[PDB]
Amino acid sequence: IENGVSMHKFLTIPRLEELYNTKQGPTNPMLFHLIRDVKQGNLPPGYKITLIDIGLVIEYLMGGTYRCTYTRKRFRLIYNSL
Amino acid sequence: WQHGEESMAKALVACKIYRSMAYEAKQSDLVDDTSEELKQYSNDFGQLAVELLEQSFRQDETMAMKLLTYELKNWSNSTCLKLAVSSRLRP
Amino acid sequence: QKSWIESTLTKRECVYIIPSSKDPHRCLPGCQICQQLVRCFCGRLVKQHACFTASLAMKYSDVKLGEHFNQAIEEWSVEKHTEQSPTDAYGVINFQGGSHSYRAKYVRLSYDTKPEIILQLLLKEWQMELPKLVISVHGGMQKFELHPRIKQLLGKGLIKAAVTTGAWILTGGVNTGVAKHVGDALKEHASRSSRKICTIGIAPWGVIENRNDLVGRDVVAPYQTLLNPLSKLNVLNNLHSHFILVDDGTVGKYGAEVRLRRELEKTINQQRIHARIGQGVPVVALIFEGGPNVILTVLEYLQESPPVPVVVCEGTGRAADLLAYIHKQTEEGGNLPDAAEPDIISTIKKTFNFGQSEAVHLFQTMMECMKKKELITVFHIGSEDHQDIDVAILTALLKGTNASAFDQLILTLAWDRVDIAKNHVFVYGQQWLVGSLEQAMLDALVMDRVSFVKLLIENGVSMHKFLTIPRLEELYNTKQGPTNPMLFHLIRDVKQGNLPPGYKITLIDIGLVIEYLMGGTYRCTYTRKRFRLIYNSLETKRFPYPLNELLIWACLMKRQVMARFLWQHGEESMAKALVACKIYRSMAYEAKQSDLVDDTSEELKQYSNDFGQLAVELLEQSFRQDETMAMKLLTYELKNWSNSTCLKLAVSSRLRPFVAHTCTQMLLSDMWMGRLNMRKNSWYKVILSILVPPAILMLEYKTKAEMSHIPQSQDAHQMTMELPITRKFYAFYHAPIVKFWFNTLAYLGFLMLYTFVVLVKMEQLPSVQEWIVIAYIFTYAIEKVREVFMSEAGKISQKIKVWFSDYFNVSDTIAIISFFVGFGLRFGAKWNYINAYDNHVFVAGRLIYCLNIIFWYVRLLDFLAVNQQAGPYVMMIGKMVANMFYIVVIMALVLLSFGVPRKAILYPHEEPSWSLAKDIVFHPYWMIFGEVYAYEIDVCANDSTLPTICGPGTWLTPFLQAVYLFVQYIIMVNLLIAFFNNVYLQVKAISNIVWKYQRYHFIMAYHEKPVLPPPLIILSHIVSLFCCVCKGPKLFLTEEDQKKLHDFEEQCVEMYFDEKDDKFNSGSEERIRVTFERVEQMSIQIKEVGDRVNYIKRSLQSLDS
Amino acid sequence: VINFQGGSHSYRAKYVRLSYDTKPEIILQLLLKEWQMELPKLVISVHGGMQKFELHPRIKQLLGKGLIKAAVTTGAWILTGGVNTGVAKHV
Ligand SMILES: CCCCCCCC/C=C/CCCCCCCC(=O)O[C@@H](COC(=O)CCCCCCCCCCCCCCC)COP(=O)([O-])OCC[N+](C)(C)C
Ligand SMILES: CCCCCCCC/C=C/CCCCCCCC(=O)O[C@@H](COC(=O)CCCCCCCCCCCCCCC)COP(=O)([O-])OCC[N+](C)(C)C
Ligand SMILES: CCCCCCCC/C=C/CCCCCCCC(=O)O[C@@H](COC(=O)CCCCCCCCCCCCCCC)COP(=O)([O-])OCC[N+](C)(C)C
Ligand SMILES: CCCCCCCC/C=C/CCCCCCCC(=O)O[C@@H](COC(=O)CCCCCCCCCCCCCCC)COP(=O)([O-])OCC[N+](C)(C)C
Ligand SMILES: CCCCCCCC/C=C\CCCCCCCC(=O)O[C@@H](COC(=O)CCCCCCCCCCCCCCC)COP(=O)([O-])OCC[N+](C)(C)C
Ligand SMILES: CCCCCCCC/C=C\CCCCCCCC(=O)O[C@@H](COC(=O)CCCCCCCCCCCCCCC)COP(=O)([O-])OCC[N+](C)(C)C
Ligand SMILES: CCCCCCCC/C=C\CCCCCCCC(=O)O[C@@H](COC(=O)CCCCCCCCCCCCCCC)COP(=O)([O-])OCC[N+](C)(C)C
Ligand SMILES: CCCCCCCC/C=C\CCCCCCCC(=O)O[C@@H](COC(=O)CCCCCCCCCCCCCCC)COP(=O)([O-])OCC[N+](C)(C)C
Ligand SMILES: CCCCCCCC/C=C\CCCCCCCC(=O)O[C@@H](COC(=O)CCCCCCCCCCCCCCC)COP(=O)([O-])OCC[N+](C)(C)C
Ligand SMILES: C[C@@H]1CC[C@@]2(OC1)O[C@H]1C[C@H]3[C@@H]4CC=C5C[C@@H](OCCC(CO)CO)CC[C@]5(C)[C@H]4CC[C@]3(C)[C@H]1[C@@H]2C
Ligand SMILES: CC(C)CCC[C@@H](C)[C@H]1CC[C@H]2[C@@H]3CC=C4C[C@@H](O)CC[C@]4(C)[C@H]3CC[C@]12C
C-alpha cells in the first residue's frame, strides 16, 4: 500500500470472489456453515461462493432490516453481467 | 480497519458480525467451538469504538453526539448508536 | 457561476496552431502527416486544440496557411494567441499511500493571474492562516539519495522550524527533486505537524504524468502515487497539501512558475505579520543539492531590495557543498585569496560540463554572492553547527539585515521562540533603547506570550516602571489576544444593564466588577477617592504593587498560565491565590447563570480550585516550619486586599481544605480558649467557676505573648498590658468556651423546666416554671434577630438568605414561631368550662407546646456538635437521610402494594372514609419494626383475634403478608444495611470536613455573643444598646513583627518551590527519561567516535608507510 | 534596603554608605549586631580585572559550583567589589 498499490483499482469482483473461496490460507470452516444455512440447507459439490450469498450471510448476522450492497438491484444486475 | 473512513462505524459492524458468528458457533455441533475467540474479537472492536467515542467527546461534545446519529449510507443507512444497541454493547 | 474561482481564474488554451518546428517525420505524402504528426508549437497534435472558434480549420487544412514568412512562425505568443477562458478544474486530489489518503488541493490557474489574486485565493477561498514565515526551498531535480545522517536531520529541523512558526514551505511539488526530500521528511514527522505545515507546490501544468486526471471542474479526482514506468514524466508528491498548477504552454515546457511563485514571495512580505506588530512577513530560502539556474536564483534573492536571506546545507549535493566552500575562500565581504580561477572554476567545470564556455559565467555569479555572506547562512554539518537547521533558518532572518534588536525580538515573539531570542538576541554587548523592551512587554502580555514576559523581567524590565494606568487600561481593552467574552457581560451587569457603542473599559468599572465578584464589604483600590480623583486627572501615575493588578487582569481575562506566572512574583502569595480562587468561583457562577453558548463554568471552577490548592499547600509548608507564625498568616490584615485576611478570603470562597487544615483548626481552638490556658485547666473547673465566681481567681490564664498569634478585640488587647483581679473576670466571661457552657447550662435548665411544664397538669395562669420558659424563648428570639441584623453583608436579603441555610436556624425559627402561637392560644383562651380540655383553644395551645419541645431537644445536637467525635456523626445523620431517600421510597411503595389488598380482602363492606387511608398504611408500617400481628394473620383460625373478619378470600392474606415481609426485611432492610456499610467511609470523611469548616462560623459567633445567657441576656441587650447611644477581632502586630512575618511568608514560599523541583527531579520517572535521552545522545557519539577511531585506522595504514 | 527586580525575586540587599576613614572595628560591629550576621568560618576575597566578556562554558559552570560549595559548606563571606562590571559579575 505504501509503495503504491491502490485498493480502489486492485480490488475487483472476481478477485474479491477468490478471496472468499481460497483454501490456501487460514480459512474459517464456519463460513460455509452459515452459507448452507441461508441458501436452502444444501450445497452443490464445490460451490464457488458468490457475493450475493455473502450479502445474505451479513444480513442474517447483522439482523433486523439490514440490507447489504451485495443483495441490491444494481449489484444483482451487474454481477449477472459479469 | 485503520485504513479508510467511518472507523467507529466499521468497528461496531465488526463487533456485531463476530457476536452473531460467536452465537451460531455456540449453536453448532462442530468440535472447535471458537465462540470465545469470536466473542473476544467482538469485544476488541467494541472497545475500539468506545475509545474513539471518548476521544471525540473530549474534543467537542456536540460534534461527537452527531457522530452517534448520522446515517452512514455505506452501512444500510443505520447509525453508529443503532449498531451498538444491536450488539448489546453497553459501554 | 456560484463560485469566485470560476469567475476570476482562467485557462490558457492554444487557439493558434503554429505547425511543429518545420519538418515532417517520414511518410512521403504530406496531407495526412501535416495534419497528424505535426503537433503545434503549442505542444500537442492538431486535433487536441478543439478550438470552439476554429474547430473547422483542421478539416479544411488547418489554421494559418503554411508559408507565412518564416519570421512570423515564432510570432506565436503565450500572451496574444491564447483565449483566456474559465478554470475547468479546481478540487481535491488524494493519495492512497502511508495509511492515509493525504488529501490536497489544486486551483489550476492560468499563469498570468495577478499576484494579489493568489493571496485572496490562499486566505479566504482556501481558508488558510496567514503564516509567520515562508521557506522557499530550491535545488535540482532527480537525485538519488543522501547520507543517512543528514537526511534524518534536515527534516527534523525543517519541520521544527515550520511547525513552531506556522510557516509555509514553497516547493515545486513534483516528486522528482526538491519536493521529494521535503515530503520524505514530512512522513518521518507526520501526524505531529500534519495540521501546521501548509506546503504549497507551485508546479506547472506541463511536466506531470496524468494532466487529464487532474482536470474536472470541482472534482475529487483520485490521483495515483505509483511511479508510472517506461517514461520520464513526474508525479505530484503525495505529502503536500496545496497545489497551484499553472495552465499554459504544454507538456514538457516547465518554465512558467518563476513569474508567479516569486510574486507570492513578494506579496506575503508586504503583509503585516500580526496586528500588534508592524514588521512584514519574512521570507527565507533553503537551497539543498542544487543546479545551475539555482546559482542564478540565489544571487537573484540576495541582490533583491530587500534581500531575501539564504541557507546552504553543505554536503547535500553540488550547489550546497560548492557554495559552502566557494563563499569560504573569501574576505568577509571583499576579495578572494591568491588567484582562485584554477581551483574554483575547476569544480565548476567538473560538476557542470563547461570547458570555459560557461565556466566564467558561474564564477561571476559566485563572486557576486560573496559580496553578501552575512545573508548566506551555511549549515556546517559535522561540527554540530546551530543544531538542527531551525536556528540556521530562523537566525538567517536575524543575521545582518540592519534590523534593530527590537525588530529581532518582536519576530521571535510572533514566532513564539524564546530559545532563539535568549541565545541570539540577548547576547553579551547587546544594547537597547529606553522603551523598546517596554513595548515588547506590552506585546507579550496582550499576546499571552508568557515565556517572553519571563525573558524580559530577567533581562531587566521593571513592572513598577512599565505598568501605568493607560497601558493597564489597554490590556483590558485589547481584542488582539485570547480575550474573555464574559468580562463585558459582568461589566454591563454592573454599569446599568447597558453599554455605549465601543466602550473603552475604565478601571473604575474593573473595580466595580471585582467588588461584585469578591462580594461582601470588599472595596477595591480602583473605586477609592484617590484613584477616582487622579484617574479624572489623567510616581503618581504608577502603581505600588503592579503584579497584584496584573494577577487580577489575567484572572478576569481567563489567562491562567499568565496568572500562575504572575502569581509567583511579588509578595502575599497565599492571599493572591485565595483572591484568584474567589474571582474565578464567582465568574464560574455567573457563567452558569448566562444563556451564552461556551459555558466555561468547569474551566473557571477548575482554575479556582487550582489556586485553592496552592493556598492550601503554602499553608502546609508554613505550618511545617513554625505553627505559631503560620497561624499569624491566617489573620494579619493585608492592606492591598481591602484589609481582609487570608482566612476570611478562604471562607468567602467556601474553601474547605484551607479552613479544615490543622493550622486553621489549631487557631480556632486557641480562640475558643480565650485568655484561659485550657492545657493547664480542665473543663470541670470551668463549669465549677461559672457556678463559683470566686474560683475564677484560681485558673491558669495566658500571657500576652502566648496570645500574640490570636486575634483580639480592641477592648481585649488593652487589658493585655498587665493580671489584676477585675481584669481576670473579664478574661473569663468573655472567653468563647465560657459563654458556651454558660449558655449550655442555661439551656439544659430551660429544658428541665419546659419538660416539667408539659408533663405536669396545666392551670389557667402559667406557673413560675412556664413563665421562665417563655422569658427564655422570647429573649432567645431577640438574640437571633440581633445575629441576623448584624451579620456581615449589608444587604438584608443576603443576611436573611444565609442564616436560613443552616438546619438549626430553620428549626429554631419554626420553634419560636410555633411556641407563641401556642402561648397565644394557651394564654388567650377564655375558660367557659371549668374542666380544662373542654376548651379546645387551650388544648391546641398545650399540644403545640408538647410538639414544640421536640425542636428544643433536637437543638441539643447542635451543642453536642461542638465535640470533635460527636459533631461529625450529627452531620452524617442528615447526609444519610438524603442519600437513603429512594430506598425508602421503594419501601413505601411495597408497603402500599400490601396494605391496599389486605384491607380490600378483609374489609369488603366499607363505605368511603378517611380511616381507609389509615388502615392501608398502619399495620404494614409496624410490620417493618418487628410486629407480625401473629393472631391476625389467619383470621379464620381458632386462635384468631379477628374471628368476625373470617370470610371468603381471607385465606389470601397470609400469602400476601409472607411476601411483604420477605421483601421488606430480607431484601429492603438488608439492602439499606449494605447501602450504609458501603457509603460510611466517604460520608464520614465529607462530614468531618464539613464539621471542621462550620467550626469557623460557630467560634466566630461566640466572639460577638453577649456574656449573659438568654434569660438574663436582656440586660446585655438593654445596657449595650443604651451605652451605644451614649457614644471585629483583629491581630495586632508591631512593625518588627510585621517585618519578621513578611519574611517568614517569603522564606516558606521559596522552600515550597525548591521542594517541588527537587521532588520532581529526584523521581524515578524523571531520572529514567533523562537517562533515556542521555543514552540516546551517547549512542550517537559512541558510534561517532566509532567512525573517527575507524578513520584513525586510516592513519595506521598511511603513517606506517 | 535596595532591591533588584530580576530573576523572579526582588533579591534584596543592604547598604550603609559609610565615609571611608571609618575605624576598622566599627565594620565588625556594623556587620555582626547592626546587620545581625553570623560570624563566618571562612572569608573568600576574590580579585581580578573589570569588564571582560565571557569564559569557556566548561569553566564557567564549574567555578561557581565549587565557589558556592566552598562558601555554603563553610558559612563563608565572599568579598567582592560588587559592581556588575567584572569580578562581581562572575560571582
Ligand atoms: C409545634 C409543631 C408545629 C410544626 C410541626 C412540623 C414541623 C416540621 C419540621 C421540619 C424541620 C425543618 C428543617 C428544615 C431545614 C432546612 C434547611 C436545610 O439545611 O435544608 C437542607 C436539607 O433539606 C431539608 O431540610 C429539606 C427538609 C428536610 C426534612 C424535614 C422534615 C422531615 C420529617 C417529616 C416527617 C413527616 C412524617 C409524616 C408521617 C408520619 C437542604 O437540602 P440539602 O442539605 O442541600 O440536601 C441535598 C441533598 N443531596 C445531598 C442528595 C444533594
Ligand atoms: C429570626 C427568627 C426569630 C424571631 C421571630 C420573632 C417573631 C415570630 C412571630 C411571632 C408571633 C406569633 C403569633 C402570635 C400569636 C397569634 C396567634 C393566636 O392565636 O393568638 C391568640 C392570642 O392573642 C393574643 O392577643 C394573646 C397573645 C399575647 C401575645 C403573645 C404572642 C406575640 C409575642 C411574640 C414573641 C416573639 C417576638 C420576638 C421579639 C420581637 C389569639 O387567639 P385567642 O384570642 O386566644 O382565641 C380566641 C378564641 N377564644 C374565644 C377561645 C378566646
Ligand atoms: C412445603 C409445605 C407446603 C406444601 C404445598 C402443598 C400445596 C397443597 C394445596 C392445597 C390446597 C387445598 C387445601 C384446602 C382445601 C380446599 C378448601 C379449603 O379448606 O380451603 C381453605 C383455604 O384455602 C383455600 O381456599 C385454597 C388454598 C390454596 C393455596 C394452597 C397453596 C398452594 C401451593 C403454594 C402456593 C404458592 C405458590 C406456589 C408456586 C411457587 C379454607 O380455609 P379458611 O380460610 O378457614 O376458610 C373457611 C372459612 N370461610 C368459609 C369463612 C372462608
Ligand atoms: C415460591 C416459594 C413457595 C413456598 C412454598 C409454598 C407456600 C407454603 C404452602 C402452604 C400449603 C398450603 C396450606 C393449605 C392449608 C389449607 C387448610 C385450610 O383449611 O385453610 C388454611 C389455608 O389458608 C390460609 O390462609 C393459610 C395459608 C398458608 C400461608 C403460609 C404462609 C407462610 C409462607 C411459607 C413459605 C416458606 C415455605 C417453606 C419451604 C417449603 C387456613 O386455615 P384456617 O383459616 O385456620 O382454616 C380453618 C381450619 N381450622 C378449623 C382447623 C382452624
Ligand atoms: C432559663 C434558664 C433556667 C435555669 C435554671 C434556674 C432557674 C429556675 C430554677 C428554679 C425554679 C423553681 C420554681 C419553683 C416554684 C415554687 C412552686 C413549685 O413549682 O413547687 C414545686 C417544687 O419545685 C419542683 O418540683 C421543681 C420544678 C422545676 C424542675 C427543674 C429544676 C431544675 C433545673 C433548673 C436548675 C438547675 C440547672 C440544671 C442545669 C445544670 C412542686 O410542684 P409544683 O410545680 O408546685 O406543682 C405544680 C402542679 N400543678 C401545676 C398541677 C398545680
Ligand atoms: C405563621 C402563623 C400561623 C398561625 C396563626 C395563628 C393561628 C390561630 C388558630 C386558630 C384560632 C382559633 C380561634 C377560635 C375560633 C372559633 C372557635 C372557638 O373559639 O372555639 C372552638 C375551638 O375549636 C378548635 O378546634 C380550635 C382549634 C384552633 C387552633 C389551631 C392552631 C393552628 C396553629 C398551627 C401551628 C402553626 C405554626 C406556625 C409556624 C410554623 C371550640 O371551643 P369550645 O368553645 O371549647 O367548644 C367546645 C366544643 N365541645 C362541645 C365539643 C366540647
Ligand atoms: C447545679 C448543677 C450542677 C452540675 C452542672 C454541670 C453538669 C454537667 C453539664 C453538662 C453535661 C456535659 C458534661 C460533660 C462535658 C465533658 C467535657 C468535654 O470534653 O466536653 C466536650 C463536649 O462539648 C459539648 O458541647 C457537649 C454538649 C453537652 C450537651 C449535650 C447533652 C446531650 C444529651 C442527650 C443525651 C441524653 C442524656 C440525658 C440525661 C438525662 C467539649 O470538648 P471537645 O470540644 O469535644 O474537645 C475536643 C477537642 N480537643 C481534642 C482539642 C480537646
Ligand atoms: C417525636 C419523634 C422522634 C424525634 C425525632 C428525632 C430527632 C430528629 C433526628 C435527627 C435530626 C438530625 C439533625 C440534622 C443534622 C444536620 C444535617 C445538616 O446540617 O444538613 C443535612 C440536611 O438534612 C436533611 O436533609 C435532613 C436532616 C434530618 C431530618 C430528620 C427528621 C426526622 C424524621 C425523618 C424521618 C421521617 C420519615 C418517617 C415517617 C414515617 C445535610 O445533608 P446533605 O444534603 O447530604 O449534606 C449537605 C450539608 N451541607 C449543606 C452542610 C454541606
Ligand atoms: C394463576 C393461577 C390460576 C388460579 C387457580 C390456581 C391457583 C391455586 C388454587 C386455586 C384457586 C383457589 C381455589 C380454592 C378456593 C375455592 C373455594 C372458596 O370458596 O374459597 C374462598 C373464596 O375463594 C374464591 O372465591 C376464589 C378466589 C381465587 C382468586 C385467584 C387465586 C390466585 C392465583 C394466583 C396463583 C399464583 C401463585 C404464586 C406465584 C407463583 C372461600 O369462600 P367461602 O367462604 O366458601 O364463601 C362463602 C361466603 N359467604 C359465607 C359470604 C356466603
Ligand atoms: C398513589 C396512591 C394510590 C392510593 C391513594 O393514594 C395515592 O389514592 C388516594 C385516594 C383516596 C380516597 C379519595 C377520596 C375519599 C373520599 C372521602 O370521603 C369522605 C367520607 C367521610 C369521611 O369520614 C365523610 O364523613 C374519604 C376518603 C377517600 C375514600 C380517600 C381515601 C384514601 C385514598 C384511597 C388514597 C390512597 C392512599
Ligand atoms: C400532620 C400533623 C397534623 C400530625 C403530626 C405530624 C408529625 C409527623 C410531626 C409533629 C411534630 C414533628 C417533629 C417536630 C420537630 C422535629 C425536629 C426537626 O429537627 C426534625 C423534624 C421533627 C422531628 C418533626 C417531625 C414530624 C413531627 C413528628
JSON list of C-alpha atoms in Angstrom, two decimals, chain C residues 881-935:
[
{"chain": "C", "resi": 881, "resn": "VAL", "atom": "CA", "xyz": [-31.19, 10.64, 55.30]},
{"chain": "C", "resi": 882, "resn": "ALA", "atom": "CA", "xyz": [-30.73, 12.47, 52.00]},
{"chain": "C", "resi": 883, "resn": "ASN", "atom": "CA", "xyz": [-28.84, 9.58, 50.43]},
{"chain": "C", "resi": 884, "resn": "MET", "atom": "CA", "xyz": [-31.20, 6.80, 51.60]},
{"chain": "C", "resi": 885, "resn": "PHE", "atom": "CA", "xyz": [-34.28, 8.59, 50.20]},
{"chain": "C", "resi": 886, "resn": "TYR", "atom": "CA", "xyz": [-35.01, 6.40, 47.18]},
{"chain": "C", "resi": 887, "resn": "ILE", "atom": "CA", "xyz": [-34.53, 3.09, 49.00]},
{"chain": "C", "resi": 888, "resn": "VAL", "atom": "CA", "xyz": [-37.16, 4.36, 51.45]},
{"chain": "C", "resi": 889, "resn": "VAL", "atom": "CA", "xyz": [-39.47, 5.45, 48.60]},
{"chain": "C", "resi": 890, "resn": "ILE", "atom": "CA", "xyz": [-39.33, 1.88, 47.27]},
{"chain": "C", "resi": 891, "resn": "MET", "atom": "CA", "xyz": [-40.14, 0.57, 50.76]},
{"chain": "C", "resi": 892, "resn": "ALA", "atom": "CA", "xyz": [-43.13, 2.92, 50.94]},
{"chain": "C", "resi": 893, "resn": "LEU", "atom": "CA", "xyz": [-44.40, 1.51, 47.63]},
{"chain": "C", "resi": 894, "resn": "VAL", "atom": "CA", "xyz": [-44.01, -2.10, 48.82]},
{"chain": "C", "resi": 895, "resn": "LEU", "atom": "CA", "xyz": [-46.00, -1.10, 51.91]},
{"chain": "C", "resi": 896, "resn": "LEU", "atom": "CA", "xyz": [-48.92, 0.20, 49.85]},
{"chain": "C", "resi": 897, "resn": "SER", "atom": "CA", "xyz": [-48.77, -2.76, 47.47]},
{"chain": "C", "resi": 898, "resn": "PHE", "atom": "CA", "xyz": [-49.52, -4.93, 50.53]},
{"chain": "C", "resi": 899, "resn": "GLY", "atom": "CA", "xyz": [-51.73, -2.60, 52.53]},
{"chain": "C", "resi": 900, "resn": "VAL", "atom": "CA", "xyz": [-54.36, -1.94, 49.87]},
{"chain": "C", "resi": 901, "resn": "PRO", "atom": "CA", "xyz": [-55.04, -5.62, 49.01]},
{"chain": "C", "resi": 902, "resn": "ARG", "atom": "CA", "xyz": [-55.10, -6.64, 52.69]},
{"chain": "C", "resi": 903, "resn": "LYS", "atom": "CA", "xyz": [-57.74, -4.05, 53.59]},
{"chain": "C", "resi": 904, "resn": "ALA", "atom": "CA", "xyz": [-59.77, -4.78, 50.47]},
{"chain": "C", "resi": 905, "resn": "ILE", "atom": "CA", "xyz": [-59.87, -8.55, 51.02]},
{"chain": "C", "resi": 906, "resn": "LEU", "atom": "CA", "xyz": [-60.56, -8.38, 54.76]},
{"chain": "C", "resi": 907, "resn": "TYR", "atom": "CA", "xyz": [-62.94, -5.38, 54.79]},
{"chain": "C", "resi": 908, "resn": "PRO", "atom": "CA", "xyz": [-65.17, -5.68, 51.71]},
{"chain": "C", "resi": 909, "resn": "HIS", "atom": "CA", "xyz": [-68.23, -3.86, 53.08]},
{"chain": "C", "resi": 910, "resn": "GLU", "atom": "CA", "xyz": [-66.76, -0.43, 53.79]},
{"chain": "C", "resi": 911, "resn": "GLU", "atom": "CA", "xyz": [-68.11, 2.94, 52.84]},
{"chain": "C", "resi": 912, "resn": "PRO", "atom": "CA", "xyz": [-65.74, 5.79, 51.92]},
{"chain": "C", "resi": 913, "resn": "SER", "atom": "CA", "xyz": [-63.86, 7.17, 54.91]},
{"chain": "C", "resi": 914, "resn": "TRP", "atom": "CA", "xyz": [-60.51, 8.64, 55.83]},
{"chain": "C", "resi": 915, "resn": "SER", "atom": "CA", "xyz": [-59.96, 5.65, 58.11]},
{"chain": "C", "resi": 916, "resn": "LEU", "atom": "CA", "xyz": [-59.27, 3.74, 54.88]},
{"chain": "C", "resi": 917, "resn": "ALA", "atom": "CA", "xyz": [-56.16, 5.88, 54.48]},
{"chain": "C", "resi": 918, "resn": "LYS", "atom": "CA", "xyz": [-55.08, 4.94, 58.00]},
{"chain": "C", "resi": 919, "resn": "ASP", "atom": "CA", "xyz": [-55.81, 1.25, 57.63]},
{"chain": "C", "resi": 920, "resn": "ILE", "atom": "CA", "xyz": [-53.85, 0.71, 54.40]},
{"chain": "C", "resi": 921, "resn": "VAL", "atom": "CA", "xyz": [-50.67, 2.15, 55.92]},
{"chain": "C", "resi": 922, "resn": "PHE", "atom": "CA", "xyz": [-50.89, 1.46, 59.67]},
{"chain": "C", "resi": 923, "resn": "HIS", "atom": "CA", "xyz": [-50.31, -2.28, 60.18]},
{"chain": "C", "resi": 924, "resn": "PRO", "atom": "CA", "xyz": [-47.93, -2.60, 57.19]},
{"chain": "C", "resi": 925, "resn": "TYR", "atom": "CA", "xyz": [-45.67, 0.06, 58.72]},
{"chain": "C", "resi": 926, "resn": "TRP", "atom": "CA", "xyz": [-45.49, -1.59, 62.15]},
{"chain": "C", "resi": 927, "resn": "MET", "atom": "CA", "xyz": [-44.55, -4.87, 60.43]},
{"chain": "C", "resi": 928, "resn": "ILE", "atom": "CA", "xyz": [-41.24, -3.24, 59.46]},
{"chain": "C", "resi": 929, "resn": "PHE", "atom": "CA", "xyz": [-40.40, -2.92, 63.17]},
{"chain": "C", "resi": 930, "resn": "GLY", "atom": "CA", "xyz": [-40.89, -6.45, 64.44]},
{"chain": "C", "resi": 931, "resn": "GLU", "atom": "CA", "xyz": [-44.69, -6.75, 64.70]},
{"chain": "C", "resi": 932, "resn": "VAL", "atom": "CA", "xyz": [-46.18, -9.51, 62.55]},
{"chain": "C", "resi": 933, "resn": "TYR", "atom": "CA", "xyz": [-49.62, -9.31, 64.24]},
{"chain": "C", "resi": 934, "resn": "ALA", "atom": "CA", "xyz": [-49.42, -13.04, 64.74]},
{"chain": "C", "resi": 935, "resn": "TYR", "atom": "CA", "xyz": [-53.00, -13.72, 65.79]}
]
